[PDB]
Amino acid sequence: GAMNSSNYAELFNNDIKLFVDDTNVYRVTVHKTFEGNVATKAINGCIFTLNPKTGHLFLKIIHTSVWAGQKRLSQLAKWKTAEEVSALVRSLPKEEQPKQIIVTRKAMLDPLEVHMLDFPNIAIRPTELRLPFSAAMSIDKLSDVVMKATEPQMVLFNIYDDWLDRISSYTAFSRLTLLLRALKTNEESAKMILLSDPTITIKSYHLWPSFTDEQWITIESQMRDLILTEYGRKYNV
Amino acid sequence: MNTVPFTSAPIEVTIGIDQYSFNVKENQPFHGIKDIPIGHVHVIHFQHADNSSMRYGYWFDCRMGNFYIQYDPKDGLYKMMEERDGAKFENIVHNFKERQMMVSYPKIDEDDTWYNLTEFVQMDKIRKIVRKDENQFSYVDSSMTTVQENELSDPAHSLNYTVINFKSREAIRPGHEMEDFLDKSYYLNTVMLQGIFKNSSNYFGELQFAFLNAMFFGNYGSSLQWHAMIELICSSATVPKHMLDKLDEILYYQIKTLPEQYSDILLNERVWNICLYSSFQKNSLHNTEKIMENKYPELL
Numbered sequence: 001g002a003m004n005s006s007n008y009a010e011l012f013n014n015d016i017k018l019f020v021d022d023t024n025v026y027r028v029t030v031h032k033t034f035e036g037n038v039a040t041k042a043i044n045g046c047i048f049t050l051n052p053k054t055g056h057l058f059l060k061i062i063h064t065s066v067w068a069g070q071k072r073l074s075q076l077a078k079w080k081t082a083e084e085v086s087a088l089v090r091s092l093p094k095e096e097q098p099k100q101i102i103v104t105r106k107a108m109l110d111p112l113e114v115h116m117l118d119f120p121n122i123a124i125r126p127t128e129l130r131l132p133f134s135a136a137m138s139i140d141k142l143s144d145v146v147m148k149a150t151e152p153q154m155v156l157f158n159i160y161d162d163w164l165d166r167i168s169s170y171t172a173f174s175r176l177t178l179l180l181r182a183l184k185t186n187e188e189s190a191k192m193i194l195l196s197d198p199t200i201t202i203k204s205y206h207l208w209p210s211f212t213d214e215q216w217i218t219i220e221s222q223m224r225d226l227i228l229t230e231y232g233r234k235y236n237v
Numbered sequence: 238m239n240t241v242p243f244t245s246a247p248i249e250v251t252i253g254i255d256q257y258s259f260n261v262k263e264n265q266p267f268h269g270i271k272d273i274p275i276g277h278v279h280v281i282h283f284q285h286a287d288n289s290s291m292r293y294g295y296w297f298d299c300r301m302g303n304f305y306i307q308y309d310p311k312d313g314l315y316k317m318m319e320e321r322d323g324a325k326f327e328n329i330v331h332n333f334k335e336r337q338m339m340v341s342y343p344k345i346d347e348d349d350t351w352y353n354l355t356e357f358v359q360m361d362k363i364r365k366i367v368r369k370d371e372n373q374f375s376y377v378d379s380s381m382t383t384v385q386e387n388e389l390s391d392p393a394h395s396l397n398y399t400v401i402n403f404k405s406r407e408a409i410r411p412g413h414e415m416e417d418f419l420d421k422s423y424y425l426n427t428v429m430l431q432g433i434f435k436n437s438s439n440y441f442g443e444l445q446f447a448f449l450n451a452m453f454f455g456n457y458g459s460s461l462q463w464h465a466m467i468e469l470i471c472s473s474a475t476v477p478k479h480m481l482d483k484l485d486e487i488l489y490y491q492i493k494t495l496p497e498q499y500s501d502i503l504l505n506e507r508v509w510n511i512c513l514y515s516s517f518q519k520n521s522l523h524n525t526e527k528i529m530e531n532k533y534p535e536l537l
């Protein structure tokens with residue numbers, strides 16, 4: 001059924017699975033026209049498709065050309081997502097195809113089920129988890145490749161860098177979700193916490209800075225603090 | 238002007254004949270139903286006074302043979318049978334009519350209700366949905382499951398309705414996923430109408446049979462079939478104008494006939510709300526929308 005706090009360890013077992021987040025597929029700026037009406041301008045988007053066990057990120061860049069001459073784009077965006085995920089599964093060797101795909105938004109269930117009818121043994125699941133994958137475009141190197149794309153493109157990343165050398169997938173996913181939650185709640189504050197000390201750099205082949213185990217504990221503490229403060233101001237609590 | 242005689246009525250029972258019903262007492266000198274209109278299928282149905290929770294009956298057409306009812310004390314039910322000796326049968330009906338121990342099919346001259354509910358229903362199509370080839374009549378009851386329900390366990394006693402599944406390869410053309418899921422016109426027109434039913438009369442005949450089994454027996458799988466066939470039309474942007482006009486008449490009479498107190502268990506809120514207010518055909522079913530809004534505004 002639905003993925004929740006009760007069945008959380010299932011994310012780190014040996015059954016291949018992917019999270020799919022469609023939040024950043026269809027992106028617009030809203031603006032006034034010369035006549036004082038409102039119009040949208042699409043900007044490049046991305047599908048966020050993540051193996052939470054390995055950290056492998058399949059970032060399908062959605063070029064604005066996709067939307068030209070199409071109607072009902074928020075509806076089309078869910079179907080285009082399902083089409084691209086389906087195309088990705090078909091492109092993988094059988095032994096690498098996922099057993100389950102977990103969609104971060106319930107509106108993706110029907111489009112993905114319909115595109116995956118050919119794969120009756122792949123389970124399409126919702127989740128009760130409120131995952132902060134919308135904040136993916138706060139990761140500077142991911143934002144860069146999306147906004148520079150001139151055509152449809154798939155780019156592969158490891159969102160955990162080399163962390164799995166030192167920590168389990170459970171711990172790596174917990175750190176990822178804490179960093180993205182912080183970036184979603186107060187992007188400027190989160191980015192300052194990550195990039196303030198200039199001695200700690202981001203390797204060319206990495207997304208996040210090269211923190212020692214001790215520095216990750218401090219960073220993780222600074223992120224939890226940022227999130228609780230912002231909760232207090234929100235709810236006047 | 239046909240007759241279905243009864244050997245006897247040994248157990249207290251409610252007897253339905255089409256949309257009508259009457260009570261018979263244990264060992265009441267009741268010997269059947271006369272003046273049954275030729276030209277239509279009919280259904281004779283039973284609920285025992287001692288078991289209100291179960292309903293069973295027989296679809297038949299008096300043009301296909303001489304049929305009678307006889308209670309079986311072993312299987313504990315009223316059974317339909319064919320009498321192959323026409324002279325013996327005429328001799329039996331004449332005697333019971335002379336002694337006036339038969340109820341008359343109580344049709345009002347003005348009243349087209351039964352024609353209106355059975356317009357496209359044909360015995361040869363009933364016998365393909367309900368398979369018992371050695372009989373010319375078809376048994377249905379409350380508990381019989383559909384082929385569709387069975388796939389999600391005795392095939393011999395199932396309702397073989399045409400399987401409709403909006404999330405199936407049959408329903409969705411490779412490369413037309415979003416188009417075919419949001420506009421079911423291809424599934425309705427090419428797969429079902431051209432492909433399986435051959436024409437809209439056969440499609441309507443199955444829709445009308447499914448409703449009647451849902452109403453008369455409380456058959457849950459029949460109710461699911463009726464709603465799926467309405468939803469397939471309502472969710473299609475491209476339907477022939479004659480089909481929409483006929484569907485509106487069909488549903489009007491079904492909603493008019495439904496018992497007011499069963500509106501809650503016989504009508505699916507989601508399907509009706511979608512069909513009348515959201516679907517491509519939301520403005521196409523004037524007669525149906527008016528009777529539903531005036532009779533069951535709570536459902537909507």
Ligand SMILES: O=C(N/N=C/c1cccs1)C1CC1
Nearest residue numbers: 452453455456457460502503
């Ligand atoms: O669940 C049901 N119960 N209906 C009972 C009835 C009793 C007599 C006629 S209908 C309907 C199939 C959906």
